[PDB]
């Protein structure tokens, strides 16, 4: 169905020629390079680099149109199909590439970044939809749970749902100490901004973290016992002592790492 | 996560039980919603899923 994709772009080149930005000869060259990619993407042995190459090539076409718009039309934006179509189609290619190759975390990463940069053009709900599929496809990758948590605590500043993302991630990955650290770090960040706001409120006129500390030791110990033991329990009494000792050593380094976290927060006691 | 989880889930799947992993994966996927329909090879596992 390569022709279907080729036909969807016909109104646009007609718009490019109608506005005078691109000559029929130049338009034909863009078409020929476009055609080669579409057959490449639809064929056998297609890889992600084909999607990246097409996205990079298509991005350049957008830049020339923008430059020529000011050079020839002398207009910031011409009200026609040309303005939002190259931008719309790039997202379509990202969907196909991410759909075609769900494994590559790298390709997903540009998709989020590309849509994030065009915040006005892509609603934050569309960024939400991408994350929901991504978290769903790779639930055990901690980096993505902290990813969407970071996006919205800064850009949107929704602590309730930023709490929710970590609250889900810890459900799937209770044994990774990194995820606990970020969810504690977020927790003290919420408290400090709340207290700083309270200080500002007066000028113009935490235990919860310690609880996250408590369980964080317990489950990390449990999982570390589950690992290093394999399928079965350890019969020898002595090893069970080293198993306990190894958790204690593993566990204390986890605790000591948090003692360093406390030092960063001056306001907290 | 490792060998240990597979066995204890392997025990749980057989006894028609729902592990924490099964509860975790299902919750993120199936919409709360009239009632969403899920296909399971086991009839015995069905009541366990319905309870949770």
């Amino acid at each position: 169905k390569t022709r279907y994709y080729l036909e969807q772009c016909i109104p646009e080149m007609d718009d490019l020629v109608e506005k005078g930005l691109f000559t029929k000869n130049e338009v034909s060259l863009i078409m020929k390079k476009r055609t080669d990619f579409e057959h490449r993407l639809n064929s056998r042995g297609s890889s992600i680099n084909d999607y990246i190459k097409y996205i990079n090539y298509e991005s350049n076409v957008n830049k020339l149109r923008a430059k020529r718009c000011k050079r020839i039309l002398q207009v910031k934006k011409t009200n026609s199909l040309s303005d939002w179509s190259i931008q719309q189609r790039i997202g379509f290619i990202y969907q196909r590439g991410t759909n075609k190759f769900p494994q590559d975390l790298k390709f997903w990463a540009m998709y989020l970044n590309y849509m994030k940069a065009r915040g006005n053009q892509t609603s934050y709900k569309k960024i939400h939809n991408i994350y929901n599929q991504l978290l769903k496809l790779h639930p055990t990758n901690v980096d993505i749970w902290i990813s969407c948590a970071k996006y919205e605590y800064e850009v949107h500043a929704n602590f309730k749902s930023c709490r929710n993302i970590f609250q889900n991630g810890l459900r799937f990955n209770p044994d990774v100490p990194k995820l606990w650290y970020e969810y504690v770090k977020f927790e003290l960040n919420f408290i400090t901004k709340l207290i700083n706001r309270r200080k500002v409120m007066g000028l113009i006129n935490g235990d919860i973290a310690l609880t996250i500390f408590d369980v964080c030791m317990k489950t990390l110990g449990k999982h570390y016992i589950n690992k290093h033991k394999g399928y079965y329990a350890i019969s020898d009494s002595k090893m069970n002592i080293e198993l306990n000792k190894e958790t204690l050593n593993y566990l204390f380094s986890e605790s000591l790492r948090y003692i360093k976290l406390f030092d960063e927060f001056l306001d907290l006691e | 996560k490792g060998a240990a989880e597979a066995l204890e889930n392997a025990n749980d799947i057989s006894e028609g039980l729902v592990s924490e992993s099964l509860k975790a994966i299902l919750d993120l996927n199936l919409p709360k919603a009239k009632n969403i329909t899920l296909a399971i090879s086991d009839k015995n596992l069905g009541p366990s899923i319905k309870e949770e």
Partner: peptide, 28 residues
Amino acid sequence: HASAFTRTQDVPQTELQEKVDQVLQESN
């Protein structure tokens, strides 16, 4: 559709959640 964003369980599933909302309830 089910999303990590909003809780569809309606009750605290993990022991973390039973604990955190208690502090949230206790705080204000």
